Structures are given as structure tokens and as C-alpha cells.
Amino acid sequence: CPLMVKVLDAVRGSPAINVAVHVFRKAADDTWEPFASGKTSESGELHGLTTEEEFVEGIYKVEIDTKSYWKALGISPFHEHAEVVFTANDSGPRRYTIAALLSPYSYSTTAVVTN
Amino acid sequence: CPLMVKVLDAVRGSPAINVAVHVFRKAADDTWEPFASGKTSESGELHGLTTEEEFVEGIYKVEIDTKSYWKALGISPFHEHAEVVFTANDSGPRRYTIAALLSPYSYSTTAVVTN
Amino acid sequence: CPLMVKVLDAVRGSPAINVAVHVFRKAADDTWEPFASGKTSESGELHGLTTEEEFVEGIYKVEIDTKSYWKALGISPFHEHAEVVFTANDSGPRRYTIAALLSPYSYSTTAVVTN
Amino acid sequence: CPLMVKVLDAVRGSPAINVAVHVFRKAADDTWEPFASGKTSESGELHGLTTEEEFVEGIYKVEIDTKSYWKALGISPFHEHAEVVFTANDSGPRRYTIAALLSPYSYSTTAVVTN
Ligand SMILES: Cc1cc(-c2nc3ccccc3s2)ccc1N
Ligand SMILES: Cc1cc(-c2nc3ccccc3s2)ccc1N
């Protein structure tokens, strides 16, 4: 509910299906601890990463494994992955959608924060 | 069902709400005839523009009235509107989503074509 | 000099070379009159479209012929072209760079306005 | 010369000036070692980060300090920074331009790779 990831393919004009996504939370020692992960669905979406109880304020990193996605399509890509790093705050809207639009040599990302 | 428009605001990190959208279809005389229109919802989406029966193959133009959107937020914009021009074909997937991500001096658009 | 167009290819990570560009200006009768045209160089850039004297106040449309670009590379893209429509020089003369980043099913455009 | 960074502001339609950029290279022990750093000029560009001799094969991370950029302009943005991670020079030496287009809740990045 509170954190969703959506991935789109700008070459095929389609959801980016079966993309691995890893979420990390910054620890007190300034290391990235694993938090949640999954693979995007047939709709390009990854739901159920976390719960309101566990998604406390902090710095989070969403890593989208774009290189493996392009390699599986036979397309040489530029990036190792796409990383989205942000602070979650409780004074802001409650639902976070991290969206990424992928091309072999480019990506765009935006946050949609609602409620 | 066959044609949906989704608009996002990259300044606020939100759906772009109440954006006027006008759809045109190219006529035989190479003029743009009005086809469908509406305003985006609270989710930034505009549904119900057309039906499968009416959405025949042809060249379509989706005009998103970005200038009025930014002016209503007190932000000086660059573009008069964002225009998305494309051919609809029956050999391709059946549902078209035209997505646009808006900033005052920039926009990005992508097509998600599924089924 | 006062109007430059730069086009990049997000699939190859390269300038988009030999892209046709047509510029129009809205006339008093609300028709798009031809204003200037050209093709991008090896650097993806198109210079020398107009002069300070000729580039008067008005509403301009920069049409970037993306479909022909992709088709020549063996890709059947979504868009017919990318159109950038804006009011120019209404505060006085300015220098405009219209940049476009192209993918088969997506494009992004931004303006850099100086002076 | 072999590595350049260019940053644009999609809110103002201008180069993003005085943006801090830190480059890291992955070491044999899989740690990110500092490689180069600098700030964008009035043109939004950062030149002279490295040399052909020093810019050997490896995995590099270009960290663009977008949060500090927006905060200085009175905007509380979403991202901590924009990170661009890529393998460089594995086919031989190349010239890399990392471009980023910034909005408060979104960024786009592309690579132009030549030679
Ligand atoms: C980064 C980016 C994202 C999008 C989209 N987000 C969403 C989010 C939810 C549903 C459809 C879409 S489509 C569209 C254009 C760009 N550039
Ligand atoms: C990431 C991105 C970058 C650009 C631009 N790169 C350059 C590089 C050199 C000169 C002008 C421009 S403009 C345009 C659109 C997007 N989305």
C-alpha cells in the first residue's frame, strides 16, 4: 500500500515485465540494508513491498535492475541499474509511487505522492 | 476503454488534476476534426473518451492544455500545450494509454499499448 | 543563433543525425505559416534556422520528424512527429534551444531560454 | 574531456548552475572509491573531471547533488540525488556525456557515448 513501483518500456511501448527491484533503507552506520524486493508484474507494477507499520521515516533506495531487463531483450544498455533515493516523511502524502520509464541509454523517474 | 490519457505533475509529485485534453482525428482533407475531450480526474486520468466502435484506424492528435494548468498554479510555463500525434492500427495491441509528465519548461510523453 | 534544435537518440546513446525539422509561425488568420526548416547535423544539432531580425514575437511550432528518423533505422515508432509549440520573444528577444530525447514509443522535450 | 556532465533545470528552462557532482569508481573489494568531483558552470556543464589516462575500465557512479540544488532555490524536492551507474571503457576508450534534466519530483538522465 504505502510504496509501489511502476516500470515502463519506451522501446516497446509496454509495461516492463519481470524487472527485478530491490529496496534498501539507510542504517545508522550509513550502510544500505535490504528492505524489500520483487519482480514487476505483467502490468509493470510491483505491489506489496511493505506495510504502513514497517515503512517508517528514513532514507530509502529503490534499485531497478535495468541492465538485466535489456540484456534479456537482446538490447545493449548503458546503465547498470536505475537508482531512486529519497526520504520518506510523515508530513507528506501517505502513498508513494516510484515510476520509471526505461530506454537503453536513458531513464526518467518520477514520484507520485498522494493522500 | 481503447484510449486513456494520464497526466502527472513533476513539480508537485502528483497527478495533474483538471487538465483539459482535446482529441482530434485527421480528416480526408488533412484537417483536424474534433473527436473527444475532457478534463483529467483527481487521479490525473481521463477515461471514457471513445469506444472500440468509434476508435477506428487513423491519425489522432491528443492535445494536453498544459499552459492553463501551470497558469492556474501561478507558474510561468514554456509550451502552449503538449501535442501527441500517432497512428492507431488494428494489428497492434488494442488499448492505448497516452501518458505525459509535465514540468514548466519540459514534458515527456510515452505510449503504453497493451492487449 | 536565436533558435536552435538539438535531438538525441535514447536507444543508441548518440545524437540523432539527419532528423528533419520544420518550424511554423501562427499567422494573423490563425494558420500555421512555414517559417524555417532544416536537418540535424552529425552532432544532432540544427543551427541557422532564423535571424534576430526575422524571429519576431509570435507563436511557433517546431515539428521534429521522428517517425521518418526511426523508420530509416528499422523501427516502427508510435508518434508521427514531436511538436513543440510555444510563444517566443514576447518579453523581448531571447535565445531558444529546443532539445528532444527520442525513443520509439516516447519522447521528452525541454527548452533552454537565455538572455 | 572523456567524461562530461550536463545538467538542466526543467522548472526555469535554464542550465542548472552550481550543482555539485561526485564521481566514484568501484574498487576490487566492491567499494565505491572517490574518483573525481566538481560543480556545474554557468552553462550547466562540468568539464575536466578526469583524463584519458586516469579514466580506465570500470564501473562508475556519477552522483548529482539535486537536493542541495533545489533547496537553495526554496524547493523541497523528492530525491536525495540522482545517481548514474554504468560500465565505462570496456570496449576501449570512449567519450561520455551524462546529461540530467531536473524537476522537484522527477529527473531524466541520458548518456551520449562517442568514439
Ligand atoms: C517517468 C514517467 C512515468 C510515466 C507514468 N507513470 C504512471 C503511473 C501510474 C500509471 C501510469 C503511468 S505512466 C509517464 C511518463 C514518464 N516520463
Ligand atoms: C535527460 C535529458 C537530457 C536532455 C539534453 N541533453 C543535452 C546535452 C547537450 C546539450 C543540450 C542538451 S538537452 C534533454 C532531455 C532529457 N530528458
**D65 three-class SS:** coil
Q: Is the dihedral of CA D88, D92, D93, D94 positive or negative?
A: negative
Domain carrying residue B72: 3-114
Kindly report the backbone phi and psi dihedral angles of residue B19, in degrees, each rounded to the nearest multiple of 5, phi listed first.
-85, 130
CA A19 to mean position of chain CA atoms? 10
B15 and A112 within 8 Å at the Cβ level: the answer is yes
Output the nine-digit C-alpha cell for D36: 573525481
How many CA atoms within 13 Å lie on the side-chain side of A48? Answer: 4
B99 lines ligand 1 (CB under 6 A): yes
Vertex A104: Cα angle to A100 and A110 (nearest 5): 15
Q: Is the dihedral of CA C109, C114, D1, D7 positive or negative?
A: negative
Q: Mark out chain D residues that contact chain C at CB-CB < 8 A.
A: 8, 10, 13-15, 99, 101, 108, 110-114
**C84 three-class SS:** strand
Give the chains touching D; criterion: ≥3 Cβ pairs < 8 Å: A, B, C
Write the DSSP symbol of residue C73. Answer: T
**CA atoms of C29 and A31, how far apart (whole Å):** 63
Pairing between β-strand D45-46 and β-strand D3-9 as defined by DSSP bridges:
antiparallel
Specify burial of residue D79 (Cβ count, 10 A radius: 0-12, 13-18, 19+): buried
A101 lines ligand 1 (CB under 6 A): yes
Instruction: Give the resolution value in Å.
Output: 1.4
Give the chains touching B; criterion: ≥3 Cβ pairs < 8 Å: A, C, D
Q: Mark out chain C residues that contact chain D at CB-CB < 8 A.
A: 8, 10, 13-15, 99, 101, 108, 110-114
Please report the DSSP string for A8-77 in residue order: EETTTTEE-TT-EEEEEEE-TTS-EEEEEEEE--TTSEE--S--TTT--SEEEEEEE-HHHHHHHTT---
Q: B101 vs A78, A109, D103, CA distance in Å? A: 23, 10, 11
Nearest CA to B60 among B94, B83, B92? Answer: B83
Spatial contact of C15 and D112, defined as CB atoms under 8 Å apart: yes
- Distance from Cα D107 to the centre of ligand 1, integer Å: 12
Vertex B68: Cα angle to C96 and C28 (nearest 5): 65
Sorted by sequence, the CB contacts under 8 Å of residue C55 that are 6+ apart come out as C2, C3, C88, C89, C93
**CA atoms of A44 and C14, how far apart (whole Å):** 27
Count CB atoms within 10 A of the CB of residue C1.
Answer: 11
**CA atoms of C107 and C101, how far apart (whole Å):** 6
Specify burial of residue C100 (Cβ count, 10 A radius: 0-12, 13-18, 19+): buried
Q: Which residue of A has its CA nearest to D63?
A: A83
Pairing between β-strand C95-103 and β-strand C3-9 as defined by DSSP bridges:
parallel
Nearest CA to D111 among B106, A79, A109? Answer: A79
**CA atoms of D4 and D114, how far apart (whole Å):** 12
Count CB atoms within 10 A of the CB of residue D92.
Answer: 7
C111 and D13 within 8 Å at the Cβ level: the answer is yes
Structural domain count, chain A: 1
A12 and C101 within 8 Å at the Cβ level: the answer is no
- Type and span of the H or E element at D69: helix D66-72
Experimental technique, in short, is: X-ray
**Nearest listed ligand to the Cα of residue B111:** 1
Pairing between β-strand B95-103 and β-strand B3-9 as defined by DSSP bridges:
parallel
- Distance from Cα A52 to the centre of ligand 2, integer Å: 38
The amino acid at residue D23 is: V
Pairing between β-strand A106-114 and β-strand B3-9 as defined by DSSP bridges:
unpaired
Q: What b/e readout covers C41-53, taking b as 16+ CB neighbours within 10 angstroms?
A: eeebbbeebbeee
Spatial contact of B27 and B60, defined as CB atoms under 8 Å apart: no
Closest approach of chain D CAs to the CA of C65, in angstroms?
Answer: 21
- Distance from Cα D9 to the centre of ligand 2, integer Å: 10
Give me Rg for the CA atoms of chain B: 14
- Type and span of the H or E element at B4: strand B3-9
Strand partners, B102: B9, B107
Output the nine-digit C-alpha cell for B106: 519540459
Write the DSSP symbol of residue B68. Answer: H
Q: C109 vs B103, B106, B108, D6, CA distance in Å? A: 10, 6, 6, 16
**C83 three-class SS:** strand
Residue C107: CATH number of its domain: 2.60.40.180
Spatial contact of B36 and B49, defined as CB atoms under 8 Å apart: yes
Pocket test for ligand 2, best of C110, C112, C113, C114 (most atoms within 8 A of CB): C110
B17 lines ligand 1 (CB under 6 A): no
Nearest CA to A46 among A72, A78, A75, A22? Answer: A22
D75 lines ligand 2 (CB under 6 A): no
Length of chain D: 115
DSSP H helices in B1-115: 66-72
The three-state (H, E, C) secondary structure of C15-60, written as one string? ECCCCEEEEEEECCCCCEEEEEEEECCCCCEECCCCCCCCCCCEEE
Give me Rg for the CA atoms of chain C: 14
CA A52 to mean position of chain CA atoms? 17
Closest approach of chain D CAs to the CA of B56, in angstroms?
Answer: 34
Count CB atoms within 10 A of the CB of residue D99.
Answer: 21
Spatial contact of A109 and A96, defined as CB atoms under 8 Å apart: no
Spatial contact of B96 and B113, defined as CB atoms under 8 Å apart: yes
Kindly report the backbone phi and psi dihedral angles of residue C64, in degrees, each rounded to the nearest multiple of 5, phi listed first.
-105, 120
Kindly report the backbone phi and psi dihedral angles of residue D105, in degrees, each rounded to the nearest multiple of 5, phi listed first.
-115, 15
Q: B108 vs A11, A66, A106, A107, CA distance in Å? A: 14, 20, 13, 11
Spatial contact of A33 and A25, defined as CB atoms under 8 Å apart: yes
Give the chains touching A; criterion: ≥3 Cβ pairs < 8 Å: B, C, D
- Is residue A39 marked as binding? no
Spatial contact of D115 and D94, defined as CB atoms under 8 Å apart: yes
Nearest CA to C96 among C62, C63, C53? Answer: C62
